Amino acid sequence: SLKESIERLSSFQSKYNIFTSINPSPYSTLTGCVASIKDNIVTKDFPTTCASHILENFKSPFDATVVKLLKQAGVHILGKTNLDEFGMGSGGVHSIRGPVINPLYPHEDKKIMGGSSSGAAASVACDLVDFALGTDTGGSVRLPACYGSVLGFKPSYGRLSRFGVIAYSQSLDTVGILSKKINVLRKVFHTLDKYDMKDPTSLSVELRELIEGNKKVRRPLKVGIVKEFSHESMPIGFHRLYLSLLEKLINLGLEIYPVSIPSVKNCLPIYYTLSPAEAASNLSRYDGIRYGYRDSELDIKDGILFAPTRSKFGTEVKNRIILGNYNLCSDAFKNNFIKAEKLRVNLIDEFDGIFRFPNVLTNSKGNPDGLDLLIVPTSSKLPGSIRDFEEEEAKSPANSYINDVFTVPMSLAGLPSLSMPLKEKTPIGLQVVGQYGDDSTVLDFVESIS
């Protein structure tokens, strides 16, 4: 078994390009659990590369808080998983180590795993680890989970510490958890759902207690399906699987409602205004001067400081940096960026207006005639081939941006959202979504119907 485990690990690694680094001695309250960690979360014991030339042999002096908490709970870390470089991408194809391949299919198929937590999802789908940690900025835990036919939970923003979680877009970045087992996932969430004073965005102890104090018995549970997300071209098999799930729920006595949340439609343009801007800002530190890759010869060229080193950024990262800097320049800032922030506020307000649970961050009262959970597709597409994904992206950025149509609103509003599979080994999923802070409801609901 042990021998059989290592051999399995070597095989799937070789065929599917899952890890960026593996424990030298693999498999040697979460005591005995084995985890993989997305390679944008810093660790003392492994390099943290962000799948980037920029940080190709970077060794952090410290463990991310989530890594420390896991270790303290007795978790063994198998290795760091491959990812889209610096978290930028939706397909898992942008990495200095090459793309991750989806293990639901023969590796010859070169099917995409989805991104940015590609390796994380793959390591779970292969049964290499008990759970994986990923990050989700616009869908990057939920989408690859969906494509690996495993659970992918993105908790409420600020519940899990981002200390040591390398910055992509800080107002959106969230640590998330992938597993095949809802029980394991809840245990991991409970372990990691903690205030961290190192993280100025960590949800305070006071607000956590306020959230708990707001919980009420809900009878019956009220579930919404969202008009604006109910009309996309969906994969073959989806409607049957979707309708079977809703029927199962209706036969349990819960109530299902149509709900319209018009602001969800503008979420992609909102996201690609805010997120590239933050990205450009957060990547301004990379210069090879204090750490990471550094050009052997020049710290400046063409009157542009750090250009030679920074040229080693991946191509998708450069594109986004360029866009983000455009978005931040004075005139564009006063227009698109300010507008995007205001619309984001509108979105949060619309969600507040339809949820019974109060939002402690906006001090909404909760709508007593509102809803407990939303159910929304995770993706409108099946995983294609790496070539097809790469071809499509080359045609237009919009073709890639649309991949996160269903996931970005919950990122923008920081809502807890769990993608769950509908059929064994099938890259189709649904999200269960609750109000900000209402993580236990989402998880218990999913556990209840599992």
Partner 1 sequence: GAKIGKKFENMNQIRDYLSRPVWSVHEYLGIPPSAEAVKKLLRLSGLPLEGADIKEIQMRLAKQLSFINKLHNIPVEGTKQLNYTKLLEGISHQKQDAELGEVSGSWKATGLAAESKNAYFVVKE
Partner 2 sequence: YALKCGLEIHTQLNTKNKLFSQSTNSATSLVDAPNHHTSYYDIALPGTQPVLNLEAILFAMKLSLALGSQVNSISQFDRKHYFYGDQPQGYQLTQHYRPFARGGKINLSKELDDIDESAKEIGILQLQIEQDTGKSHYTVITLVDLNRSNVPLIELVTKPDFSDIKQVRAFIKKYQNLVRHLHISSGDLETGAMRVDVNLSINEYARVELKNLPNTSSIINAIKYEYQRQVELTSSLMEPETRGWTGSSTVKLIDYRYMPDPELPYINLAPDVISGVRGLMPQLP
Ligand X SMILES: NC(=O)CC[C@H](N)C(=O)O
* Number of Cβ atoms within 10 Å of the Cβ of 422: 19
Amino acid, single-letter form, for residue 90: S
Q: How many residues bind ligand X (CB under 6 A)?
A: 12
- Binding track over 43-82 against partner 2, x by CB under 8 A: -----x-x----x--x-xxx-x------------------
Is residue 89 close enough to count as binding ligand X by CB under 6 A? yes
Look up 342 and say whether it is catalytic: no
CA distance 144 to 257: 28
> Which one among 10, 183, 201, 260 touches partner 1, defined by CB under 8 A?
260
CA distance 45 to 219: 48
CA distance 32 to 36: 13
Show contacts with ligand X in window 386-415 (CB under 6 A): 404
Look up 140 and say whether it is catalytic: yes
Question: In a 3-state reduction of DSSP, which class is residue 28?
Answer: coil
48 vs 140 by CB, closer to ligand X: 140
- Strand blocks (E) in 23-62: 34-38
Question: Which of the listed partners (partner 1, ligand X, partner 2, none) does 273 bind, with a CB threshold of 5 to 8 Å by partner kind?
Answer: partner 1
Single out the segment in contact with partner 2 by CB under 8 A; choices: 117-125, 276-284, 396-404, 421-429. Answer: 276-284
DSSP labels, 77-146: EEEEEP-SGGG--SSS---TT---B-TTS-GGG-BB--SSSHHHHHHHHTTSSSEEEEEESSSTTHHHHH
| Encoded tokens for 358 | 């109060």
Question: Which of the listed partners (partner 1, partner 2, ligand X, none) does 275 bind, with a CB threshold of 5 to 8 Å by partner kind?
Answer: ligand X
Cis preceding linkage at 220, omega within 30 = yes
Is residue 352 close enough to count as binding ligand X by CB under 6 A? no
Show contacts with partner 1 in window 334-363 (CB under 8 A): 335-336, 339-340, 342-343, 346, 349-351, 353-354
Look up 38 and say whether it is catalytic: yes
> Which one among 290, 302, 303, 424 touches partner 2, defined by CB under 8 A?
290
CA distance 75 to 77: 6
* Number of Cβ atoms within 10 Å of the Cβ of 184: 17
Single out the segment in contact with ligand X by CB under 6 A; choices: 87-95, 101-109, 362-370, 381-389. Answer: 87-95
DSSP labels, 290-318: SSS---SS-SEETTEETHHHHTTS-HHHH
Tell me which DSSP letter residue 220 carries: S
Show contacts with partner 1 in window 292-331 (CB under 8 A): 292-294, 298-308, 310-311, 313, 318-319, 321-323, 325-327, 329
Show contacts with partner 1 in window 178-217 (CB under 8 A): 198
Binding stretches for ligand X (CB under 6 A) = 87-90, 116, 136-140, 275, 404
Binding stretches for partner 2 (CB under 8 A) = 41-42, 48, 50, 55, 58, 60-62, 64, 162-167, 169-171, 197-201, 277-278, 280-281, 283-287, 289-291, 305-306, 325, 328-330, 333, 337
* Residues that are catalytic: 38, 116, 140
